[PDB]
């Protein structure tokens, strides 16, 4: 009955019946990375001018990133450490039209790099949800007021430089 079919689901991911390529694998693994964020998000970004690409050229000699300022190359990643630009693989150029350039990789086998794409996606759609009339939403500002007292959420979400500016004012309303 189900025992020989409890074995076939333990080998559901080993056996690849047709393989045929190495770079076609990264294309089909980048797409199902991108279609597990819901549909309402992906039209929010394109509304602001969002052009999402997949490239194979690494992001040093890409033509839409050959020219930028010396601080635009230096923004902090999901951790907080600003990374050398030769080793980055996801970037958003947003000076007049936000373009999200994603270098393709094996993205289901890897889960550290799959999180540095979702962080950069929500970086672009942040300024829409964070503000209503070019002012901070009290729907959100009451959350930062509640999350600043708990000793776990304060060093989970907030940065280290933010931890020495919020309680320095000790009530930065």
């Amino acid at each position: 009955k189900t025992e020989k079919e409890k074995f076939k689901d333990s080998i559901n991911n080993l056996v690849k019946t047709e393989f045929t390529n190495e770079t076609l694998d990264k294309i089909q693994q980048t797409q199902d990375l991108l279609k597990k964020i819901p549909k309402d998000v992906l039209e929010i970004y394109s509304e602001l001018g969002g052009e999402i690409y997949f490239t194979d050229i690494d992001l040093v000699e890409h033509k839409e990133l050959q020219d930028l300022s010396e601080e635009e190359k230096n923004s902090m990643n999901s951790r907080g450490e600003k990374v050398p630009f030769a080793s980055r693989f996801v970037f958003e150029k947003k000076r007049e039209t936000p373009k999200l350039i994603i270098n393709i990789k094996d993205y289901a086998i890897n889960s550290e790099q799959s999180k540095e794409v979702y962080y950069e996606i929500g970086k672009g759609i942040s300024l829409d949800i964070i503000s209503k009339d070019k002012s901070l939403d009290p729907e959100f500002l009451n959350l930062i007021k509640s999350l600043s007292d708990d000793s776990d959420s304060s060093d989970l979400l907030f940065s280290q430089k933010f931890k020495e500016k919020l309680e320095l004012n000790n009530k930065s309303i």
Partner: protein, 72 residues
Amino acid sequence: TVPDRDNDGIPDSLEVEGYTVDVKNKRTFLSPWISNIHEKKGLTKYKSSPEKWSTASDPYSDFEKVTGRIDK
């Protein structure tokens, strides 16, 4: 769901890139390694293999060992 090639109760992407077990109020919760929350309490960063039900081939799971549900 989450993928689990060895059926020990811990996902594949946690056995490869680090995990730890932390108690929150009175309940254990297995979680991926976060260097800002988990270094503060002295917790250990575990790594094991995503395709062995027991990494050192002894009859105790990777999940039974790190949680404490084991022969004491």
